[PDB]
Design a protein around this ligand. Structure first.
Ligand SMILES: *CCC(=O)Nc1ccc2c(O)cccc2c1
Ligand SMILES: *CCC(=O)Nc1ccc2c(O)cccc2c1
Ligand SMILES: N[C@@H](Cc1c[nH]c[nH+]1)C(=O)O
Ligand SMILES: N[C@@H](Cc1c[nH]c[nH+]1)C(=O)O
Lengths: 414, 414
């Protein structure tokens, strides 16, 4: 016997499971179309150098990499954003801006699952918070389309610029700001003692550490304004963001949370993440603005960007908990049934007619009795059974039976 | 500057190219639905042992493999059929038969492209030639749906059972039959001298070699019948196959060709391949019956199977040659244009309304003048521009302009 289990940490999607995945992806595609985003894709295999950021990111640490026979260092992508930037950079100033690009790549890791699909949505060339507004509204729209409400989920929002100021003002070199965000990102998950210890190892003293902890636990935007003024660029941007989301009609879906930083080095501005309001699951999605990445890739001119990723695993757990993923059985419009094998040529002509009319149709393929053919029709979820028998055929007719029998002229079948 | 080119032999699909790929995939999906096939998928990463067939197959020789950090021997799949069989085997006798499964996996090789997408269609649990009939009709239907006709393309058909008999009758052990098919598969591509030399290296003498060459060049089914009788199972099956395809209405698309064997070890019966009738391209698609594979994987009971693969590269070259892949520019229903920034909140409310009605819509995101917003609307392929200005808004109206302006009440927009 060959090994029937898939490779470690990887999923099979036989038809039943594939229908569930399609239910999800259909929503990602449909939301992207609704919001005017354009699809793209890139190879699952990228150069490892693409991901060397040196900020202690979990994503870059857990990289599924290997060496080709040719000696080239490659990885199965841990995320899509670097691939997106490569594409954008490759287009040069022929790229028309603003650009709104989406994809649903399988991404990988090695440490538990080693693969997941991740809906990616990115707006490129837009400096203002309107980009983040649209992105967050798109994530809410996807969740609403799956049957969830603002009672089930929300999106927590913050800006890294608040922390940027505190870190700069405390005398810390800005090369440590990204590593700091990575550490601070672990705040909720591990003990405060341990997070402070990690900040200590970076070469930051207790005073600096205190200033960071205090700002992360500020519970409102007015309180941020007290620490940094009402006209600190982050205050205006957040307020603008909330005003715009409210005008769009998703005000009940979003809220401020000063503890949201995200785990990736490249975010520079607004950051956000989706969560379930029962506090049972990990983040549903996550993103933010990353205005410097393209500059760090060698873009001659800075290109503002913002986007998010939205994984396939947590959302499904949530939807299952809420009873929003019932199995949808397979369906087919018609099952054509030869009365016997001598009727097969005629039944094939009928099959052609039905498909020509845009219907989905099967024909009984092997030899079986009429009753078993009706049972098969039921099992495959046929709406209609079309029996092709000698006597009806002589009359220019077939027998039609709605499954969820009467003689009908061929032409009236469709 | 980071490297903008993708990894060697791999394609990027920015929006323009992705639209072309979607045009193709939409056809594969739509054909599969028309023919009652169900989608599945499996991991791109499979155990290398899955592909060790030892028949000198090009497909297994050019395997993109590597070793995980954990020491496990894996490959990026060279083809899908072994993954399909693994899935089928895993289901046991809970799998309901007949099963008709399809997928569009990216498959890989290492030697020129190193990746391609390949539409796979397989019928499982069907012993009779009706399976091959449906599969071939499905491939013709996909090609017709892309704009091709039986004047452009055909499908060449044969059965390996003819050759099986000749090889058996000549005293050759049946363990050499598969390696022989692999060699004979190269007949058209390399010199007859070289093919005979390869057969010689396997330990077959000139007499045996002659018997094979003669049968491959027989130009009709009557001639096959002379070599092996009219009632040799292969004769009845082929005739049944052609009668059924003719009754379905695709008789002009298909023909007999005794030189078609295919390059894979596992085919046991009918084999086929698509070709362009100008003789300019490689095979468009290829498949056949493989009734023993599941037995060789350790299935306790034999499971008949048949299917094909249909790559994304050759078909596109053909469609390009025929002028059947014009660029389809991006479109969007509405572009909502704030008259100025003070109108942004109202324009967002309008944007929500439009999307709520099922329309695809953008809003101008950054700050720009109305004329530039109309230019952007034109560039993104907007059908309609919706201008949100103060004076119309006071009247409960917006301005609508069909792009391929008049005041309209909000409610009448949709
Ligand atoms: C539901 C559990 C979860 O989401 N799993 C998960 C998270 C992140 C991943 C990355 O980044 C890569 C591959 C697979 C996963 C899986
Ligand atoms: C159009 C050229 C062609 O079809 N290229 C091609 C053939 C076969 C492949 C396999 O089997 C794996 C990966 C990539 C290709 C590409
Ligand atoms: N790549 C990020 C999500 C993202 C997309 N665009 C910007 N951010 C992640 O994996 O979490
Ligand atoms: N796997 C075959 C095609 C096929 C699918 N099913 C049966 N045959 C190929 O790569 O050519």
């Amino acid at each position: 016997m060959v090994e029937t289990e898939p490779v470690q940490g990887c999923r099979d999607f036989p038809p039943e499971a594939m229908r569930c995945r399609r239910h999800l992806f259909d929503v990602f595609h449909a939301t992207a179309k609704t919001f005017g985003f354009e699809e793209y894709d890139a190879p699952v295999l990228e150069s490892e150098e693409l991901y060397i950021r040196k900020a202690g990111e979990e994503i870059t640490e857990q990289m599924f990499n290997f060496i080709t026979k040719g000696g080239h260092r490659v990885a199965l992508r841990p995320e899509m954003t670097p691939s997106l930037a490569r594409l954008l950079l490759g287009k040069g100033r022929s790229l028309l801006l603003p650009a709104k690009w989406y994809s649903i790549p399988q991404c990988w890791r090695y440490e538990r699952r080693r693969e997941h699909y991740q809906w990616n949505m990115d707006i490129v060339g837009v400096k203002s918070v309107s980009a983040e507004v649209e992105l967050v509204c798109a994530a809410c729209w996807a969740m609403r389309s799956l049957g969830l409400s603002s009672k089930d989920v929300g999106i927590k929002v913050n800006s890294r610029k608040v922390l940027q100021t505190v870190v700069e003002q405390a005398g810390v070199t800005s090369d440590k700001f990204a590593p700091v965000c990575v550490i601070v990102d672990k705040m909720e998950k591990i003990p405060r003692e341990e997070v402070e210890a990690q900040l200590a190892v970076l070469g930051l003293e207790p005073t600096v550490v205190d200033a960071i902890t205090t700002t992360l636990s500020l519970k409102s935007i007015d309180e941020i304004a007290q620490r940094v003024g009402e006209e600190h660029e982050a205050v205006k941007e957040l307020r603008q963001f909330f005003e715009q989301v409210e005008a769009y009609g998703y005000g009940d879906w979003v809220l401020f949370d000063a503890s949201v930083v995200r785990g990736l080095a490249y975010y520079t501005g607004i950051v956000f993440e989706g969560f379930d309001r029962e506090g049972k699951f990990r983040a549903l999605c996550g993103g933010g603005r990353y205005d410097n990445l393209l500059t760090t890739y060698g873009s001659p001119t800075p290109i503002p960007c913002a986007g998010f990723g939205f994984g396939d695993c947590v959302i499904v757990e949530l939807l299952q908990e809420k009873r929003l993923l019932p199995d949808i059985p397979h369906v087919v419009d018609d099952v054509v049934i030869p009365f016997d094998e001598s009727m097969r040529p005629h039944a094939l002509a009928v099959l052609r007619r039905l498909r020509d009319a845009g219907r989905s149709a099967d024909i009984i393929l092997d030899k079986k009795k009429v009753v078993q053919a009706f049972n098969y029709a039921d099992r495959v979820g046929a709406v209609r059974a079309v029996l092709v028998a000698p006597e009806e055929w002589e009359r220019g007719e077939v027998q039609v039976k709605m499954l969820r029998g009467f003689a009908v002229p061929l032409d009236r079948l469709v």
